[PDB]
């Protein structure tokens, strides 16, 4: 039993992050603190890396994909690490409005919702990123630009709602577990069309579950800054047509 | 009630705006206006067609921009200012009320300058003034609803000269590019100076710089 605190057993999965249980040995409070991701560092080949993820400093031995790129500490420095708080509201409002805004045309601001790269062929990561957000579908879609801009900025790549055959967003109602609609189950595409080529420069997620892990890690170390009631994240495969 | 100091107690049409103190040293902004009632209709945010001529300073654009298009959205203003004339197109700032993004989006359109040069005295030393050129030019462009830029010398350097009491401010020389002005544009520098003087006279001018005076020169 890698979880030495007894009181933690009763509290894993209760839908509440319990900070006394937020450790690898306690599975990040049974996933309550890591957006349900069991172990975000499952594939990481170096044991010290989860401890160096949150330091805003490049740790080269932790910069592999499997080690979640050291929270991009080695690929983005200085002003390029965050969208300028002063420009954020503008970028959120002009995201995917069909007109190119070069000042938002960066991976840290969300690539302007691809307004500047719309003729570049889509390059989707494998699978679908599935998010549970405690906002009903109509309310969630009412601020889809802000939601997608901020989530794109966090993942430093382009995100959008996956659409069905009739052009409708794959956003489904979420019901209170064992009734009423409490939130949304959101399905997203990850478009990596603006990613870098060289092994040293590339810092995109090749599949949905990889991006989920990174988000889970941001939550585990109290670094995720996303103004939405985000409950869980995961990657799912899709069958072929 | 020529003091070189704006006194609101003396700032009235009857006293020539404190001798031009409050109208940025512009003696009479309505000098060319073919109508007498216009100074009273300039500030009402309502279209008065009889004052909508250029010489009557377009009735403060009340007939050309009355709705949401009169000012750059306060929420986006800081972004537009910082990204003005940075050589990259920002379509969200690409409007006359936001300063046309410093013409970043119209590089294929031939320059079309108004007559003369707009000369401003600003109580900021040149080095400090130049440190915020984008904000200064963007805000001034938005107000004039056209494109403004520094005049360059033979070595391509901005013509911003020290202003002495030594070094109390700057004398700035600007050009007006009307290439995107398709009546609501100023044909010459003095007209734009007059309009600015008019805004100051009626306390409508909102410009976060210690702006002393304005004038047109050929
Ligand atoms: C991983 O690194 C992060 C920094 O890169 C650490 O997050 C930062 O933590 C500090 C202190 O814990 C916090 O400072 C402010 O905290 C107080 C308010 O906290 C609330 O408000 C902020 C502002 O929106 C919010 O982000 C917090 O999550 C919380 O809701 C202030 O009263 C205090 O004076 C101080 O200014 C930073 O805000 C916070 N930064 C971010 C981006 O979250 C994080 O703690 C670390 N992980 C650890 C230590 O486990
Ligand atoms: C013109 O209108 C503005 C808008 O409130 C006002 O602040 C200003 O005092 C007015 N001008 C005069 C001369 O009253
Ligand atoms: Ca818990
Ligand atoms: Ca690090
Ligand atoms: Ca855009
Ligand atoms: Ca006076
Ligand atoms: Ca009017
Ligand atoms: Ca620009």
Curated annotation (Swiss-Prot), chain B:
The chain holds residues 1392 to 1633 of 2321 of the full protein. Belongs to the NOTCH family. This is Neurogenic locus notch homolog protein 3. Changing residue 120 to P: In brain small-vessel-disease; exhibits increased NOTCH3 signaling in a ligand-independent fashion. Glycans are attached at residue 43. Disulfide bonds join 1-10, 6-22, 33-56, 38-51, 47-63, 72-98, 80-93, 89-105. LNR repeats lie at residues 1-32, 33-63, 72-110. It is linked to Cerebral arteriopathy, autosomal dominant, with subcortical infarcts and leukoencephalopathy, 1: A cerebrovascular disease characterized by multiple subcortical infarcts, pseudobulbar palsy, dementia, and the presence of granular deposits in small cerebral arteries producing ischemic stroke. Myofibromatosis, infantile 2: A rare mesenchymal disorder characterized by the development of benign tumors in the skin, striated muscles, bones, and, more rarely, visceral organs. Subcutaneous or soft tissue nodules commonly involve the skin of the head, neck, and trunk. Skeletal and muscular lesions occur in about half of the patients. Lesions may be solitary or multicentric, and they may be present at birth or become apparent in early infancy or occasionally in adult life. Visceral lesions are associated with high morbidity and mortality. Heterodimer of a C-terminal fragment N(TM) and a N-terminal fragment N(EC) which are probably linked by disulfide bonds. Interacts with MAML1, MAML2 and MAML3 which act as transcriptional coactivators for NOTCH3. Interacts with PSMA1. Interacts with HIF1AN. Functions as a receptor for membrane-bound ligands Jagged1, Jagged2 and Delta1 to regulate cell-fate determination. Upon ligand activation through the released notch intracellular domain (NICD) it forms a transcriptional activator complex with RBPJ/RBPSUH and activates genes of the enhancer of split locus. Affects the implementation of differentiation, proliferation and apoptotic programs. Ubiquitously expressed in fetal and adult tissues. It is found in: Cell membrane. The EGF-like domains 10 and 11 are required for binding the ligands JAG1 and DLL1. Synthesized in the endoplasmic reticulum as an inactive form which is proteolytically cleaved by a furin-like convertase in the trans-Golgi network before it reaches the plasma membrane to yield an active, ligand-accessible form. Cleavage results in a C-terminal fragment N(TM) and a N-terminal fragment N(EC). Following ligand binding, it is cleaved by TNF-alpha converting enzyme (TACE) to yield a membrane-associated intermediate fragment called notch extracellular truncation (NEXT). The lineage of its organism: Eukaryota, Metazoa, Chordata, Craniata, Vertebrata.
């Amino acid at each position: 039993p890698r979880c030495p605190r007894a009181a933690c057993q009763a509290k894993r999965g209760d839908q509440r992050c319990d900070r006394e249980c937020n450790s690898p040995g306690c599975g990040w409070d049974g996933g309550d603190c890591s957006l349900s991701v069991g172990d975000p560092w499952r594939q990481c080949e170096a044991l010290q890396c989860w401890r160096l993820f949150n330091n805003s400093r490049c740790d080269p031995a932790c910069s592999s994909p499997a080690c979640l790129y050291d929270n991009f500490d080695c690929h983005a420095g200085g002003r390029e690490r965050t969208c300028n708080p002063v420009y954020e509201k503008y970028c959120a409002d002009h995201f995917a409005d069909g007109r190119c805004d070069q000042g938002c045309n960066t991976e840290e601001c969300g690539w302007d919702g691809l307004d500047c790269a719309s003729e570049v062929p889509a390059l989707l990561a494998r699978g679908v990123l599935v998010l549970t957000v405690l906002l009903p579908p109509e309310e969630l879609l009412r601020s889809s630009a802000d939601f997608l801009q901020r989530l794109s900025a966090i993942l430093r790549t382009s995100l959008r709602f996956r659409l069905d055959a009739h052009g409708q967003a794959m956003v489904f109602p979420y019901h209170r577990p064992s009734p009423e609609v409490i939130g949304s189950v959101v399905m997203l595409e990850i478009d990596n069309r603006l990613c870098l080529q060289s092994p040293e420069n590339d810092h995109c997620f090749p599949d949905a579950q990889s991006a989920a892990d990174y988000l889970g890690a941001l939550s585990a170390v109290e670094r995720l800054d996303f103004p939405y009631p985000l409950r869980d994240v995961r990657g799912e495969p899709l069958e072929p047509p």
